[PDB]
Amino acid sequence: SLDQETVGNVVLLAIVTLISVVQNGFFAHKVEHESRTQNRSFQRTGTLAFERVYTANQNCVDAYPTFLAVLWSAGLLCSQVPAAFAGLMYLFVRQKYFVGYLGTPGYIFGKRIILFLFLMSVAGIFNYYLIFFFGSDFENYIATISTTISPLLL
Amino acid sequence: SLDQETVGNVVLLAIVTLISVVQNGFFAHKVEHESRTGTLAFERVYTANQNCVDAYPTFLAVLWSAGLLCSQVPAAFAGLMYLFVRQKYFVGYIFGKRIILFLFLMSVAGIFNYYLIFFFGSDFENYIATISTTISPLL
Amino acid sequence: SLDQETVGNVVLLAIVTLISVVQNGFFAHKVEHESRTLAFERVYTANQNCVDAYPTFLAVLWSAGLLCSQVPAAFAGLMYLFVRQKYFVGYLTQSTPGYIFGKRIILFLFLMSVAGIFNYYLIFFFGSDFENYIATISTTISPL
Ligand SMILES: CC(C)c1ccc2c(c1)c(SC(C)(C)C)c(CC(C)(C)C(=O)O)n2Cc1ccc(Cl)cc1
Ligand SMILES: CC(C)c1ccc2c(c1)c(SC(C)(C)C)c(CC(C)(C)C(=O)O)n2Cc1ccc(Cl)cc1
Ligand SMILES: CC(C)c1ccc2c(c1)c(SC(C)(C)C)c(CC(C)(C)C(=O)O)n2Cc1ccc(Cl)cc1
């Protein structure tokens, strides 16, 4: 439905987003598998093995929207390629963090990657305003010249 | 990488989202600090964070729907109010229903606006096509 | 703020998202009413399980809609919500559903996105193939 130009600005971000979706499903798969090691309803408490996978998942899930926000913020406002690479790095950290709970690491992981993607977005927004104000200064500059050189055209 | 014109339609929204990211970092940090030192104080901070995390993707959804389909300024302003109400809740240990509703209504209003402009464009096109055919033999 | 043409490519995705927001509010309301117990644990777990999966759903819904085709994506998203309703009420006897629901819908929206990306690269390479083809003739048929 969308044009070829704007999809080229998101394609790398979309690929890394799709990889994270596969990863999320893998995490969910691990939880469900560990849930059926117990034998009728789904509970959020259980054996030590289940509680470690469930909590690990819970941490990964709690940080997903934030990661998704900064990834796309960095990719669209600043630059796509670096943001997508840092996005991939976050996924590799998640993978090692999630398996790291399988005997424990802390509640938060990949703080610096979130920070880096956040910084890019700040730089991108500042880069947006710099180009906007330069555009309005160029517009005012041409408008001032036009009124000044106006009678000289007649 | 995107053009100047589209980025100007999402910039106010993106700032609010980034501030919410810092606030999410703050909430997660406050939980992390209490996790290192089960506890009666830990359960209050964990639940508060969990209550914010559970509502966050819904908020992010209505903020961006209202901003893109309706008007950016009121949506971003309401989004900033949500992060203020969110902040006060984390001190006292569902919040901001009325804000979520306001953004939801903005989106629906923006959607209704889209269709009005679409059908008007359809009406205008059909009207010009109707005159064009009946007038064609005259030239 | 966005132009009519681009908003036209996201309307159905927006509507679905908005219905899902209503459903999230319903689930959250069902939790708050129960919080004034086993009845509370089940509603909380059902909502939590739904919430956990929601951003993954929202990601593939829009990816599918934007990259592949809006109508099939929006309808599949709508199907996801019906399944999500049966799943939530299924927690509300000693037996409940598992942790995962609507995974085949997620898979379908995923595969749409992949297909939409492969569609992008096909037109792009064809666009460079055309560009390179024109440049070859423009050099050959030139000194005339
Ligand atoms: C509710 C959601 C979070 C969710 C949960 C589980 C999911 C999916 C989506 C998907 S769809 C996706 C692969 C993510 C595009 C699948 C994979 C399929 C082939 C459909 C399957 O095994 O049933 N699983 C199980 C699975 C995922 C990843 C690994 Cl590594 C192995 C098995
Ligand atoms: C899981 C995720 C959502 C997350 C969690 C914690 C995070 C970050 C990201 C970030 S990066 C961000 C500030 C969100 C752009 C930081 C801050 C940094 C500078 C990296 C640090 O101190 O380690 N913290 C700790 C922190 C944040 C905010 C306050 Cl008020 C105090 C401490
Ligand atoms: C945390 C977040 C996801 C959330 C949670 C609860 C929410 C809302 C938003 C909204 S806003 C929305 C309905 C989504 C437009 C409402 C409805 C209102 C009218 C504001 C109310 O009763 O307070 N509730 C309660 C409610 C929602 C849906 C049903 Cl079916 C019945 C009651």
3-state secondary structure chain C: CCCHHHHCCCHHHHHHHHHHHHHHHHHHHHHHHHCCCHHHHHHHHHHHHHHHHHHHHHHHHHHHHHHCCHHHHHHHHHHHHHHHHHHHHCCCCCCCCCCCCCHHHHHHHHHHHHHHHHHHHHHHHHHHHHHHHHHHHHHHCCCC
**B115 Cβ contact list (under 8 Å, min separation 6):** none
Distance A103 CA to ligand 1 centre (A): 24
How far, in Å, is the centroid of ligand 1 from the Cα of A24? 8
With contact defined as beta carbons under 8 Å apart, do C45 and A43 qualify?
yes
Other chains touching A, judged by 3 or more CB pairs under 8 Å: B, C
- The CATH number assigned to the domain holding A32 equals 1.20.120.550
DSSP B23-77: HHHHHHHHHHHHHH---TTHHHHHHHHHHHHHHHHHHHHHHHHHHHHT-HHHHHH
**CA pair distance A30, A56, nearest whole angstrom:** 10
Ligand nearest to the CA of C54: 1
**Chain B residues with CB inside 8 Å of A62's CB?**
28, 49-50, 53
How far from C120 is each of C66, C113, C115, C127, CA to CA, in Å?
Answer: 11, 10, 9, 11
When CB atoms are compared, the residue of A1, A24, A68 closest to C70 is A1
In angstroms, the Cα distances linking B133 to B11, B69, B123, B138, C132 are 46, 36, 16, 10, 43
The answer to whether C62 and B61 have CB atoms below 8 angstroms apart is no
What does the alpha-carbon distance between residue A15 and residue C113 come to, in Å, rounded to a whole number? 9
> To which residue do tokens 């090692």 refer?
A96
Closest by alpha carbon to A44, among C31, C92, B39, C52?
C52
- Give the chain A residue whose CA is nearest to the CA of B33: A107
Closest alpha carbon to C91 in C44, C54, C51: C44
Given its phi and psi angles, is residue A5 left (phi above 0), alpha (psi -120 to 50 degrees) or beta? alpha
Of B51, B54, B72, B52, nearest to B63 by C-alpha is B72
Identify the CA nearest to C117 among candidates A15, A80, B18, B71: A15
Joined together, the tokens standing for residue A124 give: 């991108």
Cβ of B22 closer than 6 Å to ligand 2, yes or no, is: yes
Report the number of distinct structural domains present in chain A: 1
Give the single-character DSSP code of B1: -
Closest-CA residue of A relative to C102 is A25
In this complex, do C7 and B114 lie within 8 Å of one another by their Cβ atoms?
yes
d(Cα A44, Cα A55) in Å, to the nearest integer?
A: 9
A43: contact with C, CB 8 A cutoff: yes
Residue whose token pair is 């010009």: B128
Measured between beta carbons, which residues in chain A are less than 8 angstroms from residue C69? Answer: 1
- How is residue B111 annotated by DSSP? H
Give resolution in angstroms: 2.6
Token pair 């559903």 is found at: C97
As a whole number of angstroms, the distance between CA C84 and CA C142 comes to 64
- Find how far residue C66's CA is from the centre of its chain: 10
Q: Find the ligand nearest to B98 CA.
A: 3
What is the distance between the terminal CA atoms of chain A, rounded to a whole angstrom?
51
The pair phi, psi for residue C90, each rounded to 5°, is -60, -20
The response to whether residue A113 sits with its C-beta less than 6 Å from ligand 2 reads no
**Closest residue in B to C29 (Cα–Cα):** B94
Could you give the CA distance from residue A51 to residue A49 in angstroms, rounded to a whole number?
6
> What six digits make up the tokens of B105?
């209504």
Residue range(s) defining the domain that contains residue B115: 4-138
Closest to C64 measured CA to CA, from C82, C78, C47, C48: C78
- How far is residue A87 from each of residues A13, A24, C124, measured CA to CA in Å? 8, 14, 24
DSSP string, chain A: ---HHHHTTTHHHHHHHHHHHHHHHHHHHHHHHHHTT------S--SHHHHHHHHHHHHHHHTHHHHHHHHHHHHHHT-HHHHHHHHHHHHHHHHHHHHHT-----S---HHHHHHHHHHHHHHHHHHHHHHHHHHHHHHHHHHHHHHSTGGG-
State CA B127 to chain mean position distance. Answer: 37
Q: Which of C15, C18, C22, C29 to mutate to test the pocket of ligand 3 (most atoms within 8 A of CB)?
A: C29
| Interrupted after residues, chain B (C–N over 2.5 Å) | 37, 93
Q: Are A45 and A35 contacting, i.e. CB atoms less than 8 angstroms apart?
A: no
Alpha carbon separation from C110 to A28, A29, B97, C114 (Å, rounded) = 16, 16, 32, 6
Q: Cβ distance C1 to B45 under 8 Å?
A: no
Kindly identify the ligand whose nearest atom is closest to the C-alpha of B97: 3
**Residues 6+ positions from A136 with CB-CB distance below 8 Å:** none
Inter-residue contact C108 to C61 (CB < 8 Å) = no
Neighbours of chain B (3+ CB pairs under 8 A): A, C
